[PDB]
């Protein structure tokens, strides 16, 4: 596996071993030299299998995110990568003709999602991913945690458009009497005809629920004409303001959904959601700035040390 010294997996959301089933997982391939192997590179290939539960995410439909060249911070070509989607093997191929590499320090990472097949039947929590090389197996571990129901959270869902945002307000926080929400995002355009909310009390083992369309709740559209619990509702192209007054039960979750249509040439979206909760006996504010990503991503400026003969 040399010069691979380690293969790590963390959640892009938390930057740690705790993750949602919906998270981007940073799969990092650490490259180091501290013995004195020669690494037969360039010409040399390193094959690493990716477990079937991980998947590359393609956007646009025609671009393979696993195919890239990687450089030093100074710009020197080091290797290129390609993934076999039939055998699930990632190949690193150095770009240095019959020319021994003496030093190699860097990290190649990709962002993967968990497959549907795995997440339908997954259960919390700890899950290990098996990466096979030729002389070693790497088995980093991640805890598949249920939704955080102790504060307002934010969730992304890619759709044909297409981001559907979810803002969940847990009644198990207050005491909750008033809810204020505002979102700003660039470059998307909010569909003001598609703001809705639901209140559910069930929750599955991952803390989630699926509201039914007109137990789990029912999706209720939000228009100018709507009355309480809606206290106020402004929707512009880049911003939405929303307020709620009502009794959120201890076992209930309020879920607000707002759609954002995207241009086809958009790959990334900045989004913040400020949530202010009023609770009897004060005012607690939250900021939720997690971005939205459409494809598996990497960083080509990956290597800090590199030298050949």
């Amino acid at each position: 596996a040399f010069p691979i010294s380690d293969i790590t997996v963390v959640s892009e959301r938390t930057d740690a071993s705790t993750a949602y089933l919906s998270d981007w997982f940073v799969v990092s391939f650490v490259f180091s030299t501290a013995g004195s192997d020669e690494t037969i590179a360039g010409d040399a290939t390193i094959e690493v299998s990716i477990p079937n539960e991980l998947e590359f995410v393609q956007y646009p439909d025609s671009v393979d995110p696993s195919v890239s060249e990687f450089f030093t911070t100074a710009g020197v070509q080091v290797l290129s990568t390609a993934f076999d989607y039939d055998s699930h093997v990632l190949t690193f191929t150095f770009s240095d003709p019959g020319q021994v590499i003496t030093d190699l320090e860097g990290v190649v990472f990709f962002t993967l999602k968990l497959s549907e097949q795995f997440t339908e039947s997954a259960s919390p929590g700890q899950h290990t991913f098996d990466f096979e090389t030729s002389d070693q197996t790497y088995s980093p571990s991640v805890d598949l945690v249920a939704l955080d129901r102790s504060q307002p959270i934010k969730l992304s869902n890619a759709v044909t458009g297409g981001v559907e945002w979810f803002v969940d307000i847990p009644g198990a926080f207050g005491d909750i009497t008033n809810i204020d929400i505002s979102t700003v995002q660039t470059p998307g355009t909010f569909d003001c005809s598609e703001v809705k909310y639901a209140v559910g009390s069930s929750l599955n083992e991952f803390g989630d629920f699926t509201p039914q369309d007109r137990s789990s709740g029912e999706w209720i559209p939000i228009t100018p004409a709507s009355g309480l619990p809606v206290e106020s509702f402004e929707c512009g192209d880049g911003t939405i303001s929303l307020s709620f007054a009502g009794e959120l039960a201890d076992d209930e979750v309020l879920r607000v959904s707002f759609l954002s249509n995207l241009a086809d040439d958009v790959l990334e979206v900045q989004n913040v959601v400020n949530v202010d909760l009023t609770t009897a006996d004060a005012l607690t504010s939250f900021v939720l700035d997690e971005p939205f990503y459409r494809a598996s991503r990497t960083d080509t400026a990956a290597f800090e040390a590199f030298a050949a003969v």
Partner: protein, 563 residues
């Protein structure tokens, strides 16, 4: 013990008892005005007399107490020399009525009484049933104002405020039809209100008396003229709230009459309706004998005679008012244009709607669980095959002559849940906003809210204690309104939180009933802690108002129509 008729072995005997109730509990003429049938017959008179007895025993303590604390109040005022200025009216309240009105009168109602924001916000809290938004094209401006005044007051015009859906109207001009008692005077005010874009506040614009020379006042008039205009409007609004709420008494009564004639006494819905209509059949007899009789308490204290007071709810009913479904919370407010962005902007603060929305939510949750527990499913054949329920609906729509009641046959649980929610909401919520402790705490607090005016309506712009009651008359107003309150509801376990907690209903209805009851007790515990904890923020406002309003506190109100 309470069951449906669907699978009852003794169904023929159950039918027989209903048929015998129908021979002895009859629809009689409307009393206390001309609205709704009042029960007569041997059984209807027995029920009427039982309720009057219960009411008699339940009024003694509060009446004696109120007279004692009125006598003390008057001794104090008299000893301090009486009223020399409008501020001495606070002597009427400070330190007094501690037993009659334990919660005291509205925090901020005396300190901030001249506030225009407090005068406009009352139409969205203390008496929220009269205000109505002006449609930009389907309604015309009621009266005109000098556009220079309108421009300096609102920074815009009546035309633009109208087209923008920012003008609201209170129309008490129908009281022009009545003549005050001698030595008493009264106007027929129309109040124009607007939503101000500069401050995002619902505010007073103009007041037109519609009597005499018919002046129009504005907050740009002299201080005493504008203050007196607000006092005249509050007089008309007090008359309105007290006499329109007769319908909050008589629409439930008629719905319960139709039910009693059709549902078995062992029907679970009959038991909950009986619980909510506790003592209800006392209000028309008692009111006719001591309140609206010649020289009764109304005549003693209010400006318009009892004959005019009694004529008003019959006139409303004759013009088509008092529909049952028409009165559902959102249906009513939407018909008046007060919910959402309705041909205009959204009201930033509607405290009655917010408190009402919470409480009705708790009641509706309970009623939903109660109906599901009785009929056993999810959001309906068991309802369709309950011939007693279907008879109730046919009876309501037919012989009982109930207006705007869901048509028979009743096919959806949601309909029954609407009916039961609306009844509980009237007896434990809507009534207590208009009547109960609300006049003494908010609607009839002196000096801004006098039951009668004691000096003639001005004919020019010049002006004061002369329109207001004297010390004895003021004590007598506070003493009557204190007698509409019931300080003992708490210790009697007759509060809105105990509405469904009657031991016989918990013993005879089934586990689902008791689980819905416990959830209702906890929900109204949350709501009552929220309301009792209310106080002023950093701008001196509570729910956007210069006074603390608590009329819908379920820990304070009774669950039934107690006065």
């Amino acid at each position: 013990q309470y069951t449906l008729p669907n699978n009852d072995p003794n169904q023929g005997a159950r039918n027989a008892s209903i048929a015998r109730k129908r021979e002895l509990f009859l629809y009689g003429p409307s009393t206390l005005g001309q609205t709704t049938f009042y029960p007569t017959g041997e059984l209807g008179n027995n029920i009427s007399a039982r309720d009057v007895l219960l009411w008699r025993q339940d009024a003694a303590n509060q009446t004696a107490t109120a007279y004692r604390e009125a006598n003390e109040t008057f001794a104090d005022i008299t000893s301090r020399g009486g009223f020399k200025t409008l501020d001495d009216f606070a002597l009427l309240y400070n330190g007094h009525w501690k037993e009659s009105v334990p919660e005291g009168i509205s925090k901020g109602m005396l300190s901030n009484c001249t506030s225009d924001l407090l005068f406009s916000m009352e139409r969205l809290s203390s008496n929220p049933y009269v205000l109505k938004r002006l449609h930009p094209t389907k309604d015309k401006l009621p009266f005109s104002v000098e556009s220079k005044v309108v421009k300096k007051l609102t920074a815009t015009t009546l035309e633009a405020l109208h087209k923008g859906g920012r003008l609201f109207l209170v129309d008490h001009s129908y009281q022009k039809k009545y003549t005050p008692q001698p030595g008493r005077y009264a106007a027929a005010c129309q109040g124009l209100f607007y939503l101000d874009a500069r401050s995002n506040q619902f505010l007073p614009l103009a007041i037109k008396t519609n009597v005499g020379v018919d002046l129009t006042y504005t907050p740009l008039d002299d201080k005493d003229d504008w203050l007196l205009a607000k006092i005249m409007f509050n007089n008309n609004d007090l008359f309105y709230s007290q006499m329109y709420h007769v319908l909050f008494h008589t629409i439930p009564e008629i719905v319960h009459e139709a039910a009693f004639r059709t549902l078995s006494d062992r029907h679970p819905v009959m038991g909950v309706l009986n619980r909510l209509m506790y003592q209800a059949y006392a209000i028309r007899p008692v009111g006719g004998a001591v309140l609206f009789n010649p020289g009764g308490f109304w005549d003693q204290n209010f400006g318009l005679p009892a004959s005019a007071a009694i004529d008003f709810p019959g006139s409303v009913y004759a013009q088509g008012g008092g529909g049952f479904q028409a009165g559902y919370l959102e249906k009513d407010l939407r018909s008046r244009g007060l919910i959402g962005e309705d041909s205009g902007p959204r009201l930033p603060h509607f405290p009655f709607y917010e408190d009402a929305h919470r409480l009705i939510g708790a009641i509706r949750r309970f009623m939903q669980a109660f109906v599901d527990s009785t009929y056993g499913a999810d959001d309906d054949g068991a309802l369709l095959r309950d011939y007693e329920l279907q008879n109730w609906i046919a009876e309501a729509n037919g012989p009982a002559q109930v207006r705007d009641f869901p048509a028979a046959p009743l096919r959806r649980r949601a309909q029954l849940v609407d009916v039961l929610t609306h009844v509980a909401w009237i007896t434990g919520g809507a009534h207590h906003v208009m009547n109960q402790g609300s006049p003494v705490k908010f609607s009839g607090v002196l000096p801004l809210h006098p039951a009668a005016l004691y000096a003639p309506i001005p004919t020019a712009k010049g002006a004061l204690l002369a329109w207001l009651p004297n010390e004895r008359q003021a004590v007598e107003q506070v003493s009557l309104l204190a007698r509409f309150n019931r300080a003992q509801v708490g210790d009697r376990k007759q509060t809105v939180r105990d509405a469904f907690a009657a031991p016989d209903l918990l013993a005879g209805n089934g586990p689902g009933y008791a689980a819905a009851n416990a959830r209702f007790v906890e929900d109204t515990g949350r709501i009552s802690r929220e309301i009792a904890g209310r106080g002023f923020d950093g701008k001196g406002l509570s729910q956007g108002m210069p006074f603390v309003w608590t009329a819908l506190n379920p820990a304070v109100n009774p669950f039934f129509l107690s006065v």
